[PDB]
Amino acid sequence: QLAIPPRLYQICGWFIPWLAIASVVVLTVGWIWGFGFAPADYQQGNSYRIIYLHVPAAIWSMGIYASMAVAAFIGLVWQMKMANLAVAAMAPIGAVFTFIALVTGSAWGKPMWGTWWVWDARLTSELVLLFLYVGVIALWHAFDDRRLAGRAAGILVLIGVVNLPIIHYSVEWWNTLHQGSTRMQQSIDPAMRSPLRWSIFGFLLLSATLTLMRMRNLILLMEKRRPWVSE
Amino acid sequence: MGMLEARELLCERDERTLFSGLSFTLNAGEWVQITGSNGAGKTTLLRLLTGLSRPDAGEVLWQGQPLHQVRDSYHQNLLWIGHQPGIKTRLTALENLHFYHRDGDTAQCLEALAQAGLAGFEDIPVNQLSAGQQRRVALARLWLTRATLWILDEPFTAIDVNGVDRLTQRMAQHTEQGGIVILTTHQPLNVAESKIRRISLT
Amino acid sequence: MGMLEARELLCERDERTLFSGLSFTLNAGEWVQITGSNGAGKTTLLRLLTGLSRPDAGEVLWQGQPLHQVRDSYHQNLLWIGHQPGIKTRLTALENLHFYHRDGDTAQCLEALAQAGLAGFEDIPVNQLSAGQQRRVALARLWLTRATLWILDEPFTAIDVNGVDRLTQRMAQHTEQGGIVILTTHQPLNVAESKIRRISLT
Amino acid sequence: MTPAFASWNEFFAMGGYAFFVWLAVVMTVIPLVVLVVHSVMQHRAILRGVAQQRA
Amino acid sequence: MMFWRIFRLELRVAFRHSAEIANPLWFFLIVITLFPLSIGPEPQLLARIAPGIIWVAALLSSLLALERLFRDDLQDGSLEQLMLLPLPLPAVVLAKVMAHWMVTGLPLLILSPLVAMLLGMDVYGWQVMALTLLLGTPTLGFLGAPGVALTVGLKRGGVLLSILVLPLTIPLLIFATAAMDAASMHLPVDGYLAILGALLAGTATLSPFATAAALRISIQ
Amino acid sequence: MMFWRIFRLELRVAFRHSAEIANPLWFFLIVITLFPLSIGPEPQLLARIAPGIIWVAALLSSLLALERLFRDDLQDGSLEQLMLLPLPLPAVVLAKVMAHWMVTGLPLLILSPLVAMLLGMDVYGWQVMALTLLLGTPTLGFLGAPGVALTVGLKRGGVLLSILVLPLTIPLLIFATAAMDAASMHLPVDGYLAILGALLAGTATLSPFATAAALRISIQ
Ligand code: HEM
Ligand SMILES: Nc1ncnc2c1ncn2[C@@H]1O[C@H](COP(=O)(O)OP(=O)(O)OP(=O)(O)O)[C@@H](O)[C@H]1O
Ligand SMILES: Nc1ncnc2c1ncn2[C@@H]1O[C@H](COP(=O)(O)OP(=O)(O)OP(=O)(O)O)[C@@H](O)[C@H]1O
Ligand SMILES: [Mg+2]
Ligand SMILES: [Mg+2]
């Protein structure tokens, strides 16, 4: 039984305080466990402490785009306004997460590469993901009439998510055509693994809180004229 | 009986409700005019009847089935000329009307343009025609189409007194044979009150 | 001697001659209508009168000098609304009317929009205004302009019966003070015959 | 109970990569705080305009 | 009302909108000429950048031409095809995209022999380039159709359309440039052409439906 | 009256929310990114190619925004500026042209710090890049305006009307790319800046009048 009146505003308001408290607490514990307590690797030294801060953003940019694709799919076939509105509530958060991943990976490889920008597979894939995010954001804001931005934004999100694996695999193969593979390998170590998990969960909770707040704001913007907003 | 049927059509754009619970059935021979002011949902209702816009609530049934289900057979008997004429400005009047004829054209399109009042302007691009002569290119389809349903959105937008007279006579023998003309006009029709079924957005 | 004056205006498009030898003088407080059929040179003549189009053979004079000679004291008191209303369709009805006003006091732009019947639709983008609400945005300038010369090309194109009456009453009092209104309407005016000077294209 | 540094920001806050570590920290905290502040301030502004239109 | 009738109508409309279909061609020529002017007598460095600049020019010319796909239809007659013409809307989109390619992607293939002489490529390099444009430009049109369908109501005529459908052409650019580059080494290019054909088949099937949905969104 | 009101109006019709101000920045970033994906990821070659990349992006943005300049006004309100607005038509053209520059020239100049390190230029290369973008990008809207005014508004227009839009920018592109290229070898580019400044001084003086005459010709 899915009700979906403007009661979604009240439901969003109910979860926001507890969700924000939980996100703050889990980020604090994950960034104190990391960034000061966990040991550092042999090769990169203390520059490796950006795992707890760069990896969660990189993971949840993809996660937020996948959630946006699911919401767009739900709002297309079933003609749901809130599913289309959830895409617009999640798009800026995913764009910010892509930006954070890009700027924290460039600041991380800079000691090794020697430059602030290298056209590798990792940076290019996140760059095109950010391009998709900003395209969705621009399309949603380019419509004067709401409830039509969200259908267009949802269709754009579906188009992008269909093409996303193609773009990712092409960029991965484009890198091997020129240089060959990743830097050395992937390794986390047992001691640095638990704080990374806590940080990933913390970014998940923070993104959930932010999307609830943005969904509440977008609900108000849509129903700014209904008598329910007598408050 | 019941070529088209409105089934509690609702449209609430922003805080204004244009109409709610609209239900009207239209059998063969109905000359129906939608009445209202410049803000009332007249174009909105017409675009709902053609299936271009889906209603917020309710549905439109062509012959007894929803428009999306029978979209193939609905478009066979349907004629829309909206506020926008629907013709290419860089193409000539005959070429634009050539696109809308199923067969036998370039000889019946010439006669249709003569009836609409464009004799001698068939080989002239639309953008080089007058404002009311540009409207007559789209209205020349009234003399070509075999569609039973005509849904016209202000066909007298820039037409002279003589052209309006010919349009009124045109969509008067169409309803005498058993056709449907759905109309939204601001100029009062020069036909008896009994021949027009006024329905408002109540 | 006198305001806008044609001096043997000649114009021909394609192979037909629209008019030749048009020589009329317009003084203050004079309401005129350019009578003609659908396809005649009515819009062409109006564009010659506003200076947008150079005559084939002839000249139009404002206050005694050719329109290109002055071009600055003529546009200062001149208001022309053509078939295309000349309004940005993405801007709201207010900021679109705010552009055309002398200073955009926003206390007279709202008053003019209310006087034009477009009350409550000031902040909605005009692309969402229906068809005559869009036409009322350009016609809302009739209550703001200090121009002494109005050039209107079918101002009742999509206006309802009440809006036409309000436009006709607005044009009546403008010509009573000192104004000049040159008009082309296919809908007959609901005003006395003695108050309209009809000039044809001969 | 067992930290990863022998002492405070004389040892902490500089693992030899202090500029790169703290640039990432600042450049990730700033956009998140910007998002949070923008959401809160936009909610407040919307609620202000709701009462503003009630006039 | 027919598929081919709509195709011919769009061809005729595009032909009479001349100097708007020639501007992408001029842009393509200027882009492919500017770089050889910048880099002096360096045949080795020209050969390394030739495929990349050629396909970037093709992409940018396609974006320049994509403005007019549905632009002069919403003002007058984007409807009369949704509302009428019992031919399904995906078929209408397919016909319009084919007619758009006939004036957008086809000239680039006709001009390819002169591009090969200008950039000093071989006959085999020209063959691979022509096969790449033949299989790549329809994909460009099919990828750009949903974006112009979404942005037709906005009528931006600017940078917005170039941030929606330009990221989507990255795999096509990558594999097209890879095919052309592998042609320079006189290496077999069968797999690259197979991948390009797979992209064309995949895009040509879903793009009409996505564009029809976007057009239905925009018309309301 | 009040030239600046026209300037602000053309600014308003471009950006309708504060979020769309960054759209040209994203467009430039995507266009810049398109080139490593085709030429390759090597930073030394991207530096030698950088003048072409930057000026192709500038030309593309100018071409995209030039269509929006006059074409959208013919349908509704290209007049009411010839007919109204007692300021001369060259002044209206100048206001529209500087609005066009501010929507195209500023985003590339503002973002030029960032794109001078993606490609790999040094400070001097960036300095000359910015000094040619400031001096050459506004021209792109001046000498392209008279051709656009004719093409987008002259019915029954032939191919030859496209000779007055893109191929007139060839000297500008050549000289600007030559200035940047000479800056790459760390050479005095003062002679090239005089040429770009003489073009800007001369073109900004004749373009508004030429565009006004073209609009008068095309409206009739
Ligand atoms: C420079 C820009 C970079 C970007 C855009 C980027 C992008 C990403 C992305 C998308 C992921 C998600 C996991 C996956 O894709 O498999 C990820 C995870 C990861 N990144 Fe990066 N990366 C960058 C640089 C770096 C650097 C320099 C390192 C140095 C060690 C690094 C280390 C890691 C690790 C270890 C993971 C864990 C993957 C997993 O466990 O799933 N990244 N990054
Ligand atoms: N995108 C939109 N297009 C048209 N109308 C819209 C839109 N969004 C909201 N509306 C509102 O819906 C109402 C529908 O009115 P409609 O278009 O039927 O008027 P109309 O009777 O056709 O006017 P006219 O008689 O001038 O043609 C309008 O008052 C308008 O304010
Ligand atoms: N660009 C053009 N626009 C309009 N008419 C043109 C053009 N070029 C040539 N003509 C011709 O000039 C003649 C003058 O038409 P005009 O526009 O004056 O008609 P009109 O009287 O305004 O019609 P309506 O009353 O419907 O507006 C027309 O017959 C037309 O064929
Ligand atoms: Mg209407
Ligand atoms: Mg006329």
Residues followed by a break in chain A, C–N over 2.5 Å? none
Residue C39 marked ligand-binding: yes
Contact A108 D20 (CB under 8 A): yes
* CA atoms within 13 Å, Cβ hemisphere of F42: 11
* Buried b / exposed e along B172-198 (16+ C-beta atoms within 10 A): eebbeeebbbbbbbbbebeeeeeebee
Separation between Cα atoms, residue C59 and residue C66, nearest integer Å: 7
Q: What are residue B62's DSSP bridge partners?
A: B4, B65
Contacts of E56 in chain F (CB under 8 A): 34-35, 38, 56
Separation between Cα atoms, residue B195 and residue A40, nearest integer Å: 90
Instruction: State the burial class of residue C140 (Cβ atoms within 10 Å of its Cβ: 0-12, 13-18, 19+).
Output: buried
Q: Which of C145, C151, C139, C140 is nearest to C182 (CA)?
A: C151
Contact call for D and C: 3+ CB–CB distances under 8 Å = no
- Placement of tokens 């074409």 in the chain: F71
Q: From ligand 1's centre to the CA of A55, what distance in Å?
A: 6
| Amino acid residing at E36 | P
Q: Are E135 and E196 in contact (CB under 8 A)?
A: yes
Chains C and F: how many Cβ contacts under 8 Å?
55
- Give the other-Cβ count within 10 Å of A70's Cβ: 15
Separation between Cα atoms, residue C59 and residue C51, nearest integer Å: 10
- Does ligand 3 come within 6 angstroms of the Cβ of C12? no
Ligand 2: which of C118, C122, C128, C130 to mutate, most ligand atoms within 8 Å of CB? Answer: C130
Q: From ligand 3's centre to the CA of F208, what distance in Å?
A: 30
Separation between Cα atoms, residue C61 and residue F218, nearest integer Å: 23
Separation between Cα atoms, residue F217 and residue F97, nearest integer Å: 19
Cα of A144 vs its chain's centroid, Å: 26
A146 secondary structure, DSSP code: B
- Give the other-Cβ count within 10 Å of A45's Cβ: 14
Q: What are residue B184's DSSP bridge partners?
A: B153
- Placement of tokens 């819009």 in the chain: C43
- Does ligand 3 come within 6 angstroms of the Cβ of C40? yes
Separation between Cα atoms, residue F77 and residue F71, nearest integer Å: 10
Q: What are residue C33's DSSP bridge partners?
A: C183, C198
Give the distance from residue E150's alpha carbon to the nearest chain A alpha carbon, in angstroms: 6
Q: Nearest 10 degrees: CA dihedral of E130, E136, E142, E146?
A: -130
Ligand 4 (single-atom ion) residues, CB below 5 Å: B 43; C 130-131
**Maximum pairwise Cα distance, chain D:** 63
Q: Which of D55, A11, C160 is nearest to B34 (CA)?
A: C160
Is the Cβ of C104 closer than 8 Å to some Cβ of chain A? no
Cα–Cα–Cα angle for A192, A198, A202, rounded to 5 degrees: 140
Distances (CA, A) of C27 to C62, C154, C174, C182: 11, 22, 14, 12
Q: Which of E60, E57, E77, E65 is nearest to E14 (CA)?
A: E65
Compute φ and ψ for F153, nearest 5 degrees: -140, -5
| Amino acid residing at A180 | G
Contact E19 F59 (CB under 8 A): no
Determined by cryo-EM
Separation between Cα atoms, residue B42 and residue B151, nearest integer Å: 12
Cα–Cα–Cα angle for C184, C190, C193, rounded to 5 degrees: 80
- Placement of tokens 């709401």 in the chain: A146
Separation between Cα atoms, residue C60 and residue C3, nearest integer Å: 10
Residue C43 marked ligand-binding: yes
User: How many angstroms separate the first and last alpha carbons of chain A?
Assistant: 27
Separation between Cα atoms, residue A18 and residue D28, nearest integer Å: 23
Ligand 1: which of A52, A117, A122 to mutate, most ligand atoms within 8 Å of CB? Answer: A122
Compute φ and ψ for C178, nearest 5 degrees: -150, 0
| Amino acid residing at C27 | N
Contact E77 B75 (CB under 8 A): no
Quick one: tokens of F16? 């309708």
The experimental resolution of this structure, in angstroms, equals: 2.9
Q: Are E103 and E66 in contact (CB under 8 A)?
A: no
Q: Which of E139, E162, E168 is nearest to A163 (CA)?
A: E168
Contacts of F27 in chain A (CB under 8 A): none
Is the Cβ of A166 closer than 8 Å to some Cβ of chain E? yes
Q: From ligand 3's centre to the CA of C38, what distance in Å?
A: 9
Q: Return the residue whose CA atom lies nearest to atom 3 of ligand 3.
A: B128
Give the distance from residue E181's alpha carbon to the nearest chain A alpha carbon, in angstroms: 11
Is the Cβ of F113 closer than 8 Å to some Cβ of chain A? no
Q: Are B49 and B26 in contact (CB under 8 A)?
A: no
Separation between Cα atoms, residue A32 and residue A52, nearest integer Å: 10
Separation between Cα atoms, residue E26 and residue F161, nearest integer Å: 12
Is the Cβ of C190 closer than 8 Å to some Cβ of chain A? no
Instruction: State the burial class of residue D53 (Cβ atoms within 10 Å of its Cβ: 0-12, 13-18, 19+).
Output: exposed
- Placement of tokens 């023998």 in the chain: B173
Cα of B128 vs its chain's centroid, Å: 24
Contact E174 A166 (CB under 8 A): no
Separation between Cα atoms, residue F41 and residue F49, nearest integer Å: 12
| Amino acid residing at F188 | P
Separation between Cα atoms, residue E177 and residue C191, nearest integer Å: 73
E119 secondary structure, DSSP code: T
Separation between Cα atoms, residue E102 and residue B137, nearest integer Å: 28
Residue C163 marked ligand-binding: no
- Placement of tokens 């001084």 in the chain: F201
Beta strand B149-153 pairing with B16-22: unpaired
Is the Cβ of A231 closer than 8 Å to some Cβ of chain D? yes
Is the Cβ of B15 closer than 8 Å to some Cβ of chain A? yes
| Chain C: residue whose CA lies nearest to A146 | C128
| Amino acid residing at C58 | G
Please check whether residue A1 lies inside any domain of the structure.
no
Separation between Cα atoms, residue A149 and residue A146, nearest integer Å: 5
Contact B85 E76 (CB under 8 A): yes
A223 secondary structure, DSSP code: T
Residue C37 marked ligand-binding: yes
Phi-psi region of B16 (alpha: psi -120 to 50; beta: other; left: phi over 0): beta
Distances (CA, A) of C40 to A200, B116, F108: 75, 16, 51
Query: Sign of the C-alpha dihedral, residues A12, A207, E165, F67?
Result: positive
The answer for residues whose C-beta is within 8 angstroms of residue C190's C-beta and 6 or more apart is C164, C165, C168
Compute φ and ψ for C148, nearest 5 degrees: -95, 5
Is the Cβ of E62 closer than 8 Å to some Cβ of chain F? no
Tell me if residue E174 falls in helix, strand or coil.
Answer: helix
Helix then strand count (H, E) for chain B reads 6, 10
Q: Return the residue whose CA atom lies nearest to atom 36 of ligand 1.
A: A55
Please check whether residue A23 lies inside any domain of the structure.
yes
Q: From ligand 4's centre to the CA of C28, what distance in Å?
A: 37
| Chain A: residue whose CA lies nearest to F18 | A141
Beta strand C25-26 pairing with B180-184: unpaired
Q: Which atom of ligand 2 is nearest to the CA of B44?
A: 18
Please check whether residue A160 lies inside any domain of the structure.
yes
Give the distance from residue E44's alpha carbon to the nearest chain A alpha carbon, in angstroms: 18
- Give the other-Cβ count within 10 Å of E20's Cβ: 23
- Does ligand 2 come within 6 angstroms of the Cβ of B18? yes
Q: Which of F53, F72, F148, F65 is nearest to F102 (CA)?
A: F65
Separation between Cα atoms, residue E14 and residue E141, nearest integer Å: 15
Q: Where are the beta strands (DSSP E) in E3-151?
A: none
Separation between Cα atoms, residue A194 and residue E165, nearest integer Å: 40
- Give the other-Cβ count within 10 Å of A50's Cβ: 24
Is the Cβ of C127 closer than 8 Å to some Cβ of chain A? yes
The answer for residues whose C-beta is within 8 angstroms of residue C163's C-beta and 6 or more apart is B38, C116, C117, C132, C136, C156
Helix then strand count (H, E) for chain D reads 1, 0
Contact F41 A141 (CB under 8 A): no
Q: Which secondary-structure segment (H or E) carries E30?
A: helix E22-38
Instruction: List the single residue in F23, F41, F43 with the smallest CB-CB distance to A138.
Output: F23
| Amino acid residing at A11 | I
Separation between Cα atoms, residue A230 and residue B26, nearest integer Å: 42
Q: Are E29 and F29 in contact (CB under 8 A)?
A: no
Query: Sign of the C-alpha dihedral, residues F78, F83, F89, F92?
Result: negative
Quick one: tokens of A143? 């419509």
- Does ligand 1 come within 6 angstroms of the Cβ of A123? yes
Separation between Cα atoms, residue A122 and residue A175, nearest integer Å: 9
Structural domains counted in chain A:
1
- Give the other-Cβ count within 10 Å of F86's Cβ: 16
C92 secondary structure, DSSP code: B
- Does ligand 3 come within 6 angstroms of the Cβ of B132? yes
Separation between Cα atoms, residue E154 and residue A142, nearest integer Å: 7
Tell me if residue B27 falls in helix, strand or coil.
Answer: coil
- Give the other-Cβ count within 10 Å of A130's Cβ: 23
Cα of C135 vs its chain's centroid, Å: 13
Q: Which of E77, E56, E68, E75 is nearest to E97 (CA)?
A: E68
What is the secondary structure of B42-89 as a DSSP string?
HHHHHHHHTTSS--SEEEEEETTEETTTTHHHHTTS-EEE-SS----S
Give the distance from residue E57's alpha carbon to the nearest chain A alpha carbon, in angstroms: 20
Q: Are F39 and F120 in contact (CB under 8 A)?
A: no
- Given 3-state DSSP classes, what are the helix, strand and coil percentages for chain D, each rounded to the nearest 5? 65, 0, 35
